[PDB]
Motif scaffolding. Structure first.
Motif, PDB file in Angstrom:
ATOM      1  N   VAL A  71      -6.568  30.685  30.923  1.00  0.00           N
ATOM      2  CA  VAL A  71      -5.633  31.668  30.374  1.00  0.00           C
ATOM      3  C   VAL A  71      -6.341  32.945  29.869  1.00  0.00           C
ATOM      4  O   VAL A  71      -5.729  33.724  29.140  1.00  0.00           O
ATOM      5  CB  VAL A  71      -4.687  31.088  29.301  1.00  0.00           C
ATOM      6  CG1 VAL A  71      -3.630  30.174  29.937  1.00  0.00           C
ATOM      7  CG2 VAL A  71      -5.458  30.373  28.199  1.00  0.00           C
ATOM      8  N   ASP A  72      -7.598  33.182  30.300  1.00  0.00           N
ATOM      9  CA  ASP A  72      -8.397  34.369  30.001  1.00  0.00           C
ATOM     10  C   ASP A  72      -8.488  34.659  28.500  1.00  0.00           C
ATOM     11  O   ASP A  72      -8.470  35.821  28.079  1.00  0.00           O
ATOM     12  CB  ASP A  72      -7.856  35.582  30.762  1.00  0.00           C
ATOM     13  CG  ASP A  72      -7.905  35.379  32.260  1.00  0.00           C
ATOM     14  OD1 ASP A  72      -8.975  34.980  32.769  1.00  0.00           O
ATOM     15  OD2 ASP A  72      -6.867  35.610  32.928  1.00  0.00           O
ATOM     16  N   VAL A  73      -8.616  33.601  27.704  1.00  0.00           N
ATOM     17  CA  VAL A  73      -8.780  33.690  26.266  1.00  0.00           C
ATOM     18  C   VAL A  73     -10.289  33.639  26.033  1.00  0.00           C
ATOM     19  O   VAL A  73     -10.946  32.693  26.459  1.00  0.00           O
ATOM     20  CB  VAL A  73      -7.985  32.583  25.542  1.00  0.00           C
ATOM     21  CG1 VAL A  73      -8.468  32.410  24.127  1.00  0.00           C
ATOM     22  CG2 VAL A  73      -6.492  32.888  25.551  1.00  0.00           C
ATOM     23  N   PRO A  74     -10.867  34.703  25.451  1.00  0.00           N
ATOM     24  CA  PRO A  74     -12.332  34.811  25.352  1.00  0.00           C
ATOM     25  C   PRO A  74     -13.002  33.957  24.269  1.00  0.00           C
ATOM     26  O   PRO A  74     -13.786  34.468  23.462  1.00  0.00           O
ATOM     27  CB  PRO A  74     -12.528  36.302  25.047  1.00  0.00           C
ATOM     28  CG  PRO A  74     -11.350  36.655  24.253  1.00  0.00           C
ATOM     29  CD  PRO A  74     -10.222  35.937  24.973  1.00  0.00           C
ATOM     30  N   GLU A 122       1.902  34.204  33.526  1.00  0.00           N
ATOM     31  CA  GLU A 122       2.178  34.722  34.859  1.00  0.00           C
ATOM     32  C   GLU A 122       0.886  35.097  35.585  1.00  0.00           C
ATOM     33  O   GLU A 122       0.722  34.757  36.749  1.00  0.00           O
ATOM     34  CB  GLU A 122       3.105  35.935  34.751  1.00  0.00           C
ATOM     35  CG  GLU A 122       3.436  36.618  36.056  1.00  0.00           C
ATOM     36  CD  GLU A 122       4.329  37.820  35.835  1.00  0.00           C
ATOM     37  OE1 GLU A 122       3.887  38.787  35.172  1.00  0.00           O
ATOM     38  OE2 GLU A 122       5.483  37.791  36.317  1.00  0.00           O
ATOM     39  N   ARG A 123      -0.040  35.765  34.898  1.00  0.00           N
ATOM     40  CA  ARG A 123      -1.311  36.164  35.493  1.00  0.00           C
ATOM     41  C   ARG A 123      -2.152  34.944  35.855  1.00  0.00           C
ATOM     42  O   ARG A 123      -2.768  34.922  36.916  1.00  0.00           O
ATOM     43  CB  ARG A 123      -2.088  37.077  34.528  1.00  0.00           C
ATOM     44  CG  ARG A 123      -3.263  37.806  35.170  1.00  0.00           C
ATOM     45  CD  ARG A 123      -3.906  38.794  34.213  1.00  0.00           C
ATOM     46  NE  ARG A 123      -4.382  38.148  32.988  1.00  0.00           N
ATOM     47  CZ  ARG A 123      -4.967  38.784  31.979  1.00  0.00           C
ATOM     48  NH1 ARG A 123      -5.155  40.093  32.031  1.00  0.00           N
ATOM     49  NH2 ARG A 123      -5.373  38.115  30.917  1.00  0.00           N
ATOM     50  N   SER A 124      -2.162  33.922  34.980  1.00  0.00           N
ATOM     51  CA  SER A 124      -2.919  32.688  35.185  1.00  0.00           C
ATOM     52  C   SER A 124      -2.320  31.834  36.279  1.00  0.00           C
ATOM     53  O   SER A 124      -3.072  31.195  37.008  1.00  0.00           O
ATOM     54  CB  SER A 124      -2.997  31.885  33.896  1.00  0.00           C
ATOM     55  OG  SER A 124      -3.789  32.600  32.965  1.00  0.00           O
ATOM     56  N   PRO A 129     -21.239  44.459  33.063  1.00  0.00           N
ATOM     57  CA  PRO A 129     -20.325  43.898  34.066  1.00  0.00           C
ATOM     58  C   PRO A 129     -19.015  43.416  33.406  1.00  0.00           C
ATOM     59  O   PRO A 129     -19.010  43.105  32.214  1.00  0.00           O
ATOM     60  CB  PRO A 129     -21.118  42.711  34.644  1.00  0.00           C
ATOM     61  CG  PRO A 129     -22.504  42.843  34.132  1.00  0.00           C
ATOM     62  CD  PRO A 129     -22.406  43.586  32.845  1.00  0.00           C
ATOM     63  N   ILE A 130     -17.915  43.308  34.167  1.00  0.00           N
ATOM     64  CA  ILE A 130     -16.620  42.870  33.622  1.00  0.00           C
ATOM     65  C   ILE A 130     -16.753  41.471  32.945  1.00  0.00           C
ATOM     66  O   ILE A 130     -16.180  41.255  31.867  1.00  0.00           O
ATOM     67  CB  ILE A 130     -15.484  42.917  34.703  1.00  0.00           C
ATOM     68  CG1 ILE A 130     -14.703  44.233  34.619  1.00  0.00           C
ATOM     69  CG2 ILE A 130     -14.486  41.775  34.589  1.00  0.00           C
ATOM     70  CD1 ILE A 130     -15.385  45.382  35.057  1.00  0.00           C
ATOM     71  N   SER A 131     -17.538  40.558  33.541  1.00  0.00           N
ATOM     72  CA  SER A 131     -17.714  39.227  32.972  1.00  0.00           C
ATOM     73  C   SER A 131     -18.433  39.236  31.609  1.00  0.00           C
ATOM     74  O   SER A 131     -18.437  38.210  30.928  1.00  0.00           O
ATOM     75  CB  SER A 131     -18.486  38.332  33.937  1.00  0.00           C
ATOM     76  OG  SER A 131     -19.862  38.679  33.975  1.00  0.00           O
ATOM     77  N   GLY A 156      -3.757  46.904  27.365  1.00  0.00           N
ATOM     78  CA  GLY A 156      -2.440  46.599  27.905  1.00  0.00           C
ATOM     79  C   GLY A 156      -2.057  45.138  27.960  1.00  0.00           C
ATOM     80  O   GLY A 156      -0.893  44.819  28.192  1.00  0.00           O
ATOM     81  N   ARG A 157      -3.011  44.236  27.713  1.00  0.00           N
ATOM     82  CA  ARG A 157      -2.825  42.780  27.728  1.00  0.00           C
ATOM     83  C   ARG A 157      -1.502  42.311  27.085  1.00  0.00           C
ATOM     84  O   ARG A 157      -0.792  41.505  27.688  1.00  0.00           O
ATOM     85  CB  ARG A 157      -4.012  42.103  27.010  1.00  0.00           C
ATOM     86  CG  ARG A 157      -3.898  40.594  26.814  1.00  0.00           C
ATOM     87  CD  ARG A 157      -4.576  39.813  27.918  1.00  0.00           C
ATOM     88  NE  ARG A 157      -4.244  38.389  27.835  1.00  0.00           N
ATOM     89  CZ  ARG A 157      -5.138  37.410  27.822  1.00  0.00           C
ATOM     90  NH1 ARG A 157      -6.436  37.686  27.910  1.00  0.00           N
ATOM     91  NH2 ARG A 157      -4.745  36.145  27.750  1.00  0.00           N
ATOM     92  N   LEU A 158      -1.156  42.827  25.894  1.00  0.00           N
ATOM     93  CA  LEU A 158       0.057  42.392  25.210  1.00  0.00           C
ATOM     94  C   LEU A 158       1.283  43.277  25.470  1.00  0.00           C
ATOM     95  O   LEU A 158       2.397  42.844  25.148  1.00  0.00           O
ATOM     96  CB  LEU A 158      -0.189  42.319  23.697  1.00  0.00           C
ATOM     97  CG  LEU A 158      -0.960  41.095  23.232  1.00  0.00           C
ATOM     98  CD1 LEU A 158      -2.405  41.442  22.938  1.00  0.00           C
ATOM     99  CD2 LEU A 158      -0.295  40.446  22.034  1.00  0.00           C
TER     100      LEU A 158
END
Ligand SMILES: Nc1ncnc2c1ncn2[C@@H]1O[C@H](COP(=O)(O)OP(=O)(O)O)[C@@H](O)[C@H]1O
Ligand SMILES: Nc1ncnc2c1ncn2[C@@H]1O[C@H](COP(=O)(O)OP(=O)(O)O)[C@@H](O)[C@H]1O
Ligand SMILES: Nc1ncnc2c1ncn2[C@@H]1O[C@H](COP(=O)(O)OP(=O)(O)O)[C@@H](O)[C@H]1O
Lengths: 483, 495, 497
Positions: free
Chosen positions: A110-113, A444-446, B197-199, B390-392
């Protein structure tokens, strides 16, 4: 005990990693080269740190008691670590290690860092007063903080089914009063807090809404639905929910709202069934005045689970082993939506794949609470509620747009006003609306990421392997590109 | 080039003498007029030199076992805005004077684009081609350690960045070394460096940032009819011709964006020869040719020319390579009316004088080459925010737009009735694509476009205030010095 | 300008390191007990010697100052930290228009090796502010000092465990007090050891007793340790001890005055004293108290009644010990063959050129090098830093305890003897001598600091003698001192990995 306390569930998580790691291995070398890939996968798999604690507590009767507790941090590829705290006599170091690893992969899908983490205090909360539970919580917080196992940028704990918002409030209060007194972000050391202590709006139903959004993202994909012989959408769909806690109740209420008909509801004590439908508001009100769903007037009683009931969607919403090799061939649902961790055994997964039954995995579907946890931590870092400075700005822009359309048309040839629904959205605009949009966007993205991973590796309806491979690819890239 | 360092010093001296007289009048402090002048001159004297320069000597064990002493430096020109910001160069041609001049250039560049950082610049005296990736990692990690121990790297102290000689892998090693050792207890440790890098916390929209800044910078002046009437041209990119000297990442991106808005590319110059076609050169066709042959020479839809395209008949000339191109000898032969500096120092002061006499507008590097600097600021902010842009709000914006269109549809159906049916209000094909593909890069590009637009108007107002006309370079330096001066003046200069 | 500002003195220090590093190189590879090949062991030794030689960090500063007239001025300053093998770094601050980055780098390296010969656990450091202090008021000098302290502290170039500065000939105790006050008030406010950030402080600010005479006492003990050694004295054709010895001092500053005072106290006769303005001479002797009193009332030693005036320096005067006590190039290839002294005691940095060193070795003249002999102030600066860490003066809790133990020891001897010999003829009083009684009554911190300095100079002299015998260097004590310093710095890097 829960399914999350079961040693066989820990072996399952380890096996899911091993399966996923062997699949990505060949593709990672293409993107001495096999030594780096295998080496990094060997580093990722075990927990980096495990802390075992022994701390004293003075009971309300005056006697002292030594409390045993632990916290594992599986990964630091993303800091802080994130993970709940369980108060149970069934906790163990192996549990805390396996659930920490599960949280690393769940956060990655879920792209939670955050890296994964998990704590356990070996006590039965029923044997303690609220004063004793506060003493245990505050002392455990102190011992974790002194060793780097709690902090806004180090490790951010959360509640569990065994712990709640009052305990999280005590953790934040103890940390901000002592070790983290000089930290402007001290209240971001823990999530699941009450609103008066820095909590976020939209946390209560976060898990339930995540289950609905997760199901919705696959149910409205015609490619996956044609394989199951079904039409897209919730209209003319039937569903059954096993486990009527908070996740089961919320998922029932959200699917019903979109046209899906609840044909059966299962509970720890018996189950109810009605092929014409069961109303979630009527069932919730019945359970609130009788303690159980048994005896519901608009449903028939059944002695046993609803896992084999004729429906389209089966939602295991209770943390227990439900789908095994013995009952998997008797399942009549085409979609199995895992609203809890580990309700399906690997043998049942194999049977479902042979029967063309789509299992939406817990690593993805049960990540709604984890997603809104991230937003609560961000809210405490921001030191402001979401939308506070932009709701009125957005409202004025919307009115200016409608006024521009009205003036342009009057010039060319006419009241242009918001719909009743849009006006209500504008008037009631608050933090929960941004959290809900943020959760729906994440889910939705996940879902699309998992679908693309399943198509990349030709996994078909094996969404669990796709979700694990997706998580391992992301964790691998962080280690690989960091050196 | 030592002559480029003298240039930057001369640009400051010119700008400081122009602002000096106007700054004493604007001083509203209760001081004598002699103390006001001492304060203005005193602050301008503090601004000019680098406040701090650190010289380092650090050991490295080569892959063969032998030891090597590496020499490196980092200059922090100003702390009026913290943290400091600036790239790291790995080159045997680096020097303390280079690192000092480029740090000062970065202070003024950040000020024109309202990026709240002082200027900084680092150099490690090594030829990267002579080292393995393992040795380059050792050099990068040890250099990071020595800078961190002396206050020359940190999220709130000094935030380095890559260069043409360094890349995103080296930036990743810097952030990883800082977050593992000195900045372990810092929640913002990964904001100690940009170009990642993005990562590792990098930002989307970083690879095309400078080319987009060149586009937006040209656009803000080309859409201003006052400046275009002076050059004898109509506003807009339609019926405009352009030539690009230097076909790297900045040359290609500028060529792509100008073409996308109607401008016709008549010539492209490269390190090895140049191509020309008065009917036009397609950027996608030229990029595909270079990717399969290594060079633009032999392009079927263009003619070969042995030399630069600086004297080719066009409206806009874009020097997009870091080299001295426009000098006093070829400046009178330039046929373009606009010279867009997509690189640092492509025009000498003598060529600037000729362009002013010939009514040629030079959009200076201090402004036009700040797209990468602007996006570096957004990457640092992204790491502080701990969330992607923009994530939220993307799903929330999307729902609001559909509610807006539904409100227009319902209001019109209510006004004109049901005869002839429903009046569907739906998004255009372009709007639908914007909604569906909405990601972080769109917000980064929006913030860069807003920055270039606001800074262009600021430079135009400074040029009109001091009657500088087409001398946009002096207007940009004066604009930068006015901003840096106000920070020192309103803070006090003695604790 | 001083000899320490001279670019040729920096080349000298570099040459001394290169000479010493080539001598230790062969013996260092033999002592390596690591599991490496005999080719890889030479890479480690040469590699570590290549790391040691240059300064690790150099900070260049530009900072504003508001003059007393209201006008602003940009001040340029620098600080080099040569080595961090021992933290904190240690080194003075020079206020001079003749300072340069090369000066600050070479003097920082000199301080690394000087600390190593006297076992002072600090890496070398040196700062310079490019201003002529005569052109500034005390208020402007305070502003410069406080702002320079602030800029160093923000970059890790001052702090009790990072870098501990000190005064110079151009700076004093008031400036050191301002450095400590600025650091403890701002950056180091939360540090219990904030006042240990700088040495050379006044006593009221954490300074140590025995600091003013530190360099002069170190020169005395350094000379004393070699002059008592009969092996070295037989080579020079002299008897051990200061009795019947003659000496001449070039430079009548504080080092020259203290050195002259302590040598005279031990029987050595001062035959000549040189100054910036002329020199005086008397073969029968010059009294240091009479000469100091004359200079305090006339500003110069010229016209001293019990001495004869001479135009030039006293470097060629017939004596046994020659003490260059001024920071200037004095002994060169032209006057080295005319030197009549058998011992040349360097009480300053760089008074002898490498060409003069070669002539002295050919003439069997022992040169006690500056790296060792001028390390008295460095040693006591270590003790001041320790005193600030301790937060107590030396001897505070033990002087009275020691006094009572001494009396109990004398009482024990008295009682034992009265018991053994009886009371015919009476009591056998065992009392302290007049000198011991005065030592007991006047016991203060300076006595412990002097003992600490004397022990350091004695231990370091034996270390240098053993290094000279190990490498067969003879009277080349300078090379022995540099080799001794490089061996110690090498071992710290080698055993740390
Ligand atoms: N827990 C995690 N572990 C590893 N990688 C992660 C994790 N969370 C996110 N990532 C990845 O890190 C990168 C960060 O991208 P960014 O655009 O800044 O964030 P996001 O798109 O997730 O909001 C993405 O490639 C994302 O997939
Ligand atoms: N690098 C800089 N040096 C000096 N002043 C700066 C710098 N960057 C911005 N400023 C100025 O500081 C002020 C900050 O205003 P603010 O509204 O917070 O930011 P901005 O308008 O630049 O987004 C503005 O007047 C801006 O021009
Ligand atoms: N500045 C220095 N550089 C390198 N080694 C040093 C330095 N000062 C002292 N040493 C060495 O480090 C060791 C410390 O020994 P220790 O007994 O603690 O101190 P000391 O005997 O000098 O009072 C000794 O071998 C000493 O020679």
């Amino acid at each position: 005990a829960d399914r999350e306390d079961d040693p066989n569930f820990f072996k399952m998580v380890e096996g899911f990693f091993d399966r996923g790691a062997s699949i990505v291995e060949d593709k990672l070398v293409e993107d001495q080269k096999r030594n780096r890939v295998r080496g990094i996968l060997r580093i990722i798999k075990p927990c980096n740190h495990v802390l075992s604690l022994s701390f004293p507590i003075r009971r309300d009767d005056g006697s002292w008691e030594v409390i045993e507790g632990y916290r594992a941090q599986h990964s630091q590829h993303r800091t802080p670590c994130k993970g709940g705290i369980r108060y149970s006599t069934d906790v163990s170091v192996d549990e805390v290690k396996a659930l920490a690893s599960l949280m690393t992969y769940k956060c990655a899908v879920v792209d939670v860092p955050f890296g994964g983490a998990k704590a356990g205090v070996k006590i039965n909360p029923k044997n303690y007063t609220d004063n004793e539970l506060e003493k245990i919580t505050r002392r455990f917080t102190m011992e974790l903080a002194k060793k780097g196992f709690i902090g806004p940028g180090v490790d951010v704990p959360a509640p569990d089914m065994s712990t709640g918002e009052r305990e999280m409030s005590w953790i934040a209060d103890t940390y901000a009063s002592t070790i983290g007194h000089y930290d402007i972000n001290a209240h971001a050391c823990v999530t699941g807090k009450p609103i008066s202590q820095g909590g976020i709006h939209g946390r209560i139903s976060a898990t339930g809404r995540g289950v609905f959004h997760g199901i919705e993202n696959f149910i409205n994909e015609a490619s996956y639905m044609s394989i199951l012989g079904m039409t897209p959408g919730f209209g003319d769909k039937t569903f059954a929910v096993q486990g009527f806690g908070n996740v089961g109740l919320h998922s029932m209420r959200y699917l019903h709202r979109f046209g899906a008909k609840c044909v059966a509801v299962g509970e720890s004590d018996g189950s109810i069934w009605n092929p014409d439908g069961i109303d979630p508001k009527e069932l919730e009100d019945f359970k609130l005045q009788h303690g159980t769903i048994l005896g519901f007037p608009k449903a028939k009683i059944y002695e046993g689970s609803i896992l084999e009931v004729d429906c389209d969607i089966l939602i295991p919403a209770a943390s227990e082993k439900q789908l095994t090799k013995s009952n998997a061939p008797r399942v009549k649902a085409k979609i199995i939506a895992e609203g809890a961790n580990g309700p399906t055994t690997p043998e049942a997964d194999k049977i479902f794949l042979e029967r063309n039954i789509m299992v939406i995995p817990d690593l993805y579907l049960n990540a709604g609470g984890v997603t809104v946890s991230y937003f609560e931590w961000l809210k405490n870092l921001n030191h402001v509620s979401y939308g506070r400075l932009t709701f009125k700005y957005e409202r004025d822009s919307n009115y200016h747009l409608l006024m521009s359309v009205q003036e342009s048309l009057e010039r060319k040839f006419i009241p242009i006003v918001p719909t009743a629904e849009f006006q209500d959205r504008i008037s009631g605009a608050s933090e929960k609306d941004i959290v809900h949009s943020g959760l729906a966007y994440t889910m939705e993205r996940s879902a699309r990421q998992i679908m693309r991973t399943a198509m990349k590796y030709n996994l078909g309806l094996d969404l669990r392997t796709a979700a694990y491979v997706n998580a391992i690819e992301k964790v691998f890239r962080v280690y690989n590109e960091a050196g």
